[PDB]
Each structure stands twice: as C-alpha cells, then as structure tokens.
Amino acid sequence: TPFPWNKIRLPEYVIPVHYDLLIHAQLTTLTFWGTTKVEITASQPTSTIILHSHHLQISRATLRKGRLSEEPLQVLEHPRQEQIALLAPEPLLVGLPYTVVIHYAGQLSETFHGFYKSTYRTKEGELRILASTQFEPTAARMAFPCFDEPAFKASFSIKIRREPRHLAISNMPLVKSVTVAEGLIEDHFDVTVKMSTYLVAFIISDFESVSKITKSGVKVSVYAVPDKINQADYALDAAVTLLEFYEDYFSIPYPLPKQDLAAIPDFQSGAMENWGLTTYRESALLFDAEKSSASSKLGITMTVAHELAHQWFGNLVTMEWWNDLWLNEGFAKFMEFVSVSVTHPELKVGDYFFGKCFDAMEVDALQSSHPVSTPVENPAQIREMFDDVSYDKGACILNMLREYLSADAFKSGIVQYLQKHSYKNTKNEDLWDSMASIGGVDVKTMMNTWTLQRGFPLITITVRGRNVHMKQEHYMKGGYLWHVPLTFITSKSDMVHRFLLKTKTDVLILPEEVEWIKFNVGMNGYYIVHYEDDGWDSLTGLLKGTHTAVSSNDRASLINNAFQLVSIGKLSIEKALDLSLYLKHETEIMPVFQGLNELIPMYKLMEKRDMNEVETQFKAFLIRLLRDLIDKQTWTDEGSVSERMLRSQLLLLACVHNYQPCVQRAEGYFRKWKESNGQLSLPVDVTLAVFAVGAQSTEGWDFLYSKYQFSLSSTEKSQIEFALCRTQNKEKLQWLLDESFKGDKIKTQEFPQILTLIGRNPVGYPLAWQFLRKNWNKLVQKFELGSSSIAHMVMGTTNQFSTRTRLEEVKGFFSSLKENGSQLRCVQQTIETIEENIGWMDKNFDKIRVWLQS
C-alpha cells in the first residue's frame, strides 16, 4: 500500500485539541512504552489521519468516537517524512470530536534529543541513570506520536509510570500519585494550557530541589542532582526576580502555578524553555560562590532571563513556522538585556549588547548568509535556524527598532502583540502590525528590509563644511537597500542626533562646522560606517589624543569598523593598525576586547602557516600594546564583573604568550596549589592563567586532570578542560578528543568545545579537523545534522585555515558526504570564511610584516 501523503508538512484539515500522554520508562533496560490519546476534529471528510512518529514501534492504533465506538486503525509508516498514516474503516464526520489512541514502545535515545538517557556519578562513585526530554524543534515525535508542528497547539495531560525510587516532574504540578501493578507508581500532572508539542517535558531522576514563591504566588524551584543542589540559590533568586520583572513588564501574568529550572547532567544546547519545566546545562544554572567565574555568574543570569522571556516570547506566542524562529529567539535574546539591565544593574549588561551584533555581522557579511526570515522544510534545515542570525541579528534589529520608536512605544507594541496573539501563532507581519498600532509610525517597509534581505549596509559619510553626505551600499566580503535609522554625535554636540536614511543617498546640514562626527552612537545600529577624506585620520586622532571624548562602546565600534573596512579595501591595514595603537591607553573592557577580537584572529591564521617570524613579532606587538594594562592587574577576585572578566582574560593572554612577569607568578600559584594537594583556594580570576601554565608540564597536566574527577564546579571543570587543551603533547590532545567523544571521563556535552579548543592549539590544530572527518558519522548521529553543535565543530576546526590546499580539503570532504552534510549552511560559511582568509592574507601579510618592522 503506497503512503497516502507526499508532503513534509502535515495536512491542514485534521486538528488536535488535547493529548493524554501516558509514558512508562524502564531505566534499567532503557525501554519506554506509551499510550497517546489525541482528541481531534476533521474539517474535511477523511478516512486517513497523518501525523508524526520517529523510531516508535506502534503496536495498536484505534479511533474512538463518543456511546463509545471504537474502530481499529490500520497503520502505515513513511520513515523519511517521519510520518505515520492511520486508516479508519469509514470516514470521520466533519466537526465532530474523535480520539485517536496509539500504543507504542521505544528505546531511550543515546543522543541529547528526544526522550534521552543522562547519567552522572555520585561523589561516592555510584553511576546514576536518569531520563529527560529535549524536543525543540522536531523531536517530540520521538517520544509520542503527534501533530509535531508548532502551529498545531493543544493542551496536554501527562501521566508517568515510574519506580518508587525515582521522582518525576513535568510541565505542570503533580496532582496525584497512584500505585499501579508490578511495583510502579503512576504520577498524574495537571493539564497544560494550549501550547506547541515542542514544549512538552518530563524528567525521571533522583533530583533534589529548592523553592521560593514569587509575589504573584508562582512556586519557582531549582532541581539538580543531590551533590549540586547547594549550588542552586543564585539561580533560584534570579529566576524569582526575573519572572516578577516580566509579569510586570508585559502586564501579562505567568499562567501556570509553578516554574521549575532543572540542571541536567547531559545537555546539548545551553538551556530550553519548556513551559513550566525549563532545563539547563549544569554550567548554565549552578553557581558555586567560591569557584564560579564572574562570566559564569553573568551567563547564569542571562540564561535564566532568556528562558523566562520565552514564557511569553515563544510559549504564549509562538512563530507559526520555523521560517520565523527569530520571533521567538531574537526576542528572547534581546529581552535578556532589557530585563537584566533592571534586575541586576551591577552587571551593567547593556554595555555588552553590541558585541552580539558584531557576532552576527561576522556571519552576515558573507555572500551566502540567509535573511532573518527564510524558508525551511526538513528537520536539519529547521535546526540550522538556531544560529547567530536568528538570535543575535534578531536581537540587534529589535534593539535598533526600539531605539528608533523609543522604549515606551516599543513596549506598548510588545504588549499589544503578546495580548492579541496569546495562545496562538504569529508571522513577521503580525509584529509589524502590532508595532504600528501604537496609528503610530509604520514599521513594515523598514523592518522588511532588515528581515527579508541578508546582510547589512555600509554607510559612507563625506563631510564638506556643514554638508554631511550619506550613502548606503551592501557590505559584503568577496541592489540592496535598507531603511537605516542613523544616529550621530559630533565634536560640538553629544546629543544623539537621528536621521532616517531610506534611500541610496541623502544629505543633512550641520548647524555649524565640527572637528569630527561619529555615526552609530553606542553601536545601537546594525550597520557599519566608513568616513571619506580625512575622516579616519580625525577619528584616529580623537582616539589618540582624547579617547574619552566618545563612550567605551563608541571606541569599540571604531576599532571593529576600521578592521572590517580593510576587508573590503576601504581602509588600509596600516591605517587600521595605526588606529589600534591608541589601545596602549585604553582601560575599558569593551574596546580592549574588541581589539583582541580583531587582532587575535590575525595571528591564529599565522599559526597555521609558514610565518614564524611575523607571527612572533605580531604576538610581541599585541603584548606590548596591552602591557601597561596587563601589569596593572591584581591577582585577586576584586572589583566589578567587568573588572574581573578583564583581569582574567588579560592574565591568560599574557601567560599564553610567555610574558615572563605573568608566567612566573602563575607558576608560583600552580606550585603552591599542587604542593597543598589543591587545598589552597586560588583566586578564580587567575585560575585560567594558573592552570594553563601548570598544564604545560607532564606532571602539571597529570595533576590537573587528577582533580577533574572530583570537581562539582562547572567553572573549575571548564577551566581544567581549557588548560588541558593547551598541551603541546599530541598524544594528550588525541586522548582529550577520544575521551570526550566517548563521554566516560569527560562528558560528550564538552566535546564540541574541546574539539574547537584543540583546533585552535598552535601545535595540535590538524588533529581536530582530522578527528571531525574521521568521526563525522558518529558525531552527526550524536548531535544531528543542522545543529548548532555540528555548525560550531565545522567552523571551529576549519575557519582559521588560509591556504588553497586547506580550502580544497574542506570542499572535497563535505561534497563527498552527499545527503549526510554536503548542503549544510555551516559548510558554505566556513568555505567563504577560508576564501576570505586566503585573500586577506595574500593582500595584507607583507603589509603587516613591513608595518611591524617600521
């Protein structure tokens, strides 16, 4: 019998309203069984129900009407479309309720998606097995058969059968636990509100918990393994504050009685926003006040803010289809900064936002970047939407739109959009309609330019007395027109002046002549700026003579833009390097980090070429440039989060480049720490430098690795992994890859990061690209084609190559995969990146060699 449906998308005429899911997982055999009952209605007469199912063995399917009548359903499967077809003996009557009942079995996934196995070892040595879920985007169909597309919203009543030794949690509160046959307990959770299948969640584990109630009465809890629940308090307090913030900000209460935050021992992404049961990597939630870094504290706060923003932007209101995933992700990413700027003002997170926009511009400058909203169909293409364009470009265009409309008008537009579309699905046009309903400024033409075209513009400024000429063109490495909300300040006015450039060119007249003008104030706009004539000389002079004339983020924007303009031949590498010399007097984290972001990649290219002399001189130039700031750092955990992050990065950079004052200090801490058998608490902020130096000897590497198995600190485990990956012993590098790939000694959730760190090691970088090619199939099976993890592995191991032989290795390898990876967007991105690295190094290597000598 041929399969009666030939489309990836399900039919539109059979709609679910409610699911009753009974799941029994047997954690000793890793088998699970389920009974799914789905209440549906048909709007057309049909005798066939198509729905999703992947890797489930269906034993029986029946159609109930009512007066109960049952009819057996015949089951057909189309595994490539991940669909099943259920055939009824007579047509369903239009508009009447029916209930499809499906009994099935499956095996817990050994990946990080679907209903999957997670393990950990107690401090006492016992291996413990738990089961958890990760469904977004298309894996709910691996746990229960369903209409697995986000616009088929429905309510869900979940029942879990489990051994008495385990705890089960799910989206909603536990309302009853009933003893059933064969020594099991069946937990019944309350019915969810109407929501997408990808948000269903359930966990069977040994977790402990802590809780706190919001002012609105919502019970917030953190769940973690017993040995780590003592690290839950920071996240619990942050979650209560952030949930209260969003309820007030949006004027829409959180609608469930409780919100859980569960730290899972094995987790692929950072976290997931399942309604009522948000999940996290342990590193993204758990804070050890003695060993966690300042960056970790900031990251937990932002991750909790992101998952809680999604309760409104993603859960309450959901994109209709994955082409518009940015409506969920760009908003959640932007709301991290809107919220944490108010809830945790000590973190000064608004100061860091622009860096996310420069992350998006790296990808979006390439010829094959995709528009923010773009068509996708199959699961791998949908997973590719979880990328820096949806998250970071999405947040950056919303920031630009909020600055343009004003925070109050943008907030009113948010609130109207969330209220109007509550418990429903949206597309881009709904957001523009809401934003314009405030009848306010129409946003559709402008925002279509930022969502339906790839890339961003270069704005060129030419000043002739009071006349300021503006032009826009597409910025691309290797037709476009936007509505660009420009901003500028000048030597005579630090008010933010606004000008909307909707055309190829325009002109404005300053009230009086100025000494300099600086566009894109605060880097709040998604564009870059070039200045003709003496413009770059004037801004270089401003940075050299009176750098505080513009904000720290404005100085970071000039550093980034100057180097981006070298790439397209608008500014010479010598002039961009001359501008970077001002950094000898820079004190602030954002412009220092932007200088590292532009200069460090240049030596990473040199490390993989026959360029020892220039590589050495370039690294010496970088340390000389920042030497005074490096020397001023204390070897402590003092200061604000920015002061701490700046210290840690600078000491690590200095030690990696063998700056003897820092190496000697790091060697002394490592020796004292090792001689004390690790008793001695080191300042967290110097730990990366200390461990990186210590792991350079065989005794130090072995000692550091010996402490890894006992650590309960996600920061300490991360710092040890980083340091071990800096070894120049290739047998130890291969061991790190083999062992993290296997997941026993080092968990596989760390393998993507370890592979990129080894891909960036100056001696062992070939091993990482080699490992990726040899183990590709298993890596795809574990992490999935199209995943952000596979994208980071492909870029991480290849995007610092700069020869035509390496470019052909990448093209030849990936083209040979055919359906198993040749068409990945990350592969085209890394090819275009290597093509740019080849051209940039051919054009600029000798110029840099001469500049360093002069």
Ligand SMILES: O=C(CN1C(=O)CSc2ccc(Cl)cc21)NC1(C(=O)O)CCCCC1
């Ligand atoms: O270079 C890298 C990693 N890395 C890149 O690979 C190119 S993108 C990048 C941007 C900024 C910074 Cl701080 C590092 C970057 N890390 C160090 C190194 O030399 O490998 C140098 C810093 C100390 C830690 C080591």
Ligand SMILES: [Zn+2]
């Ligand atoms: Zn998100």
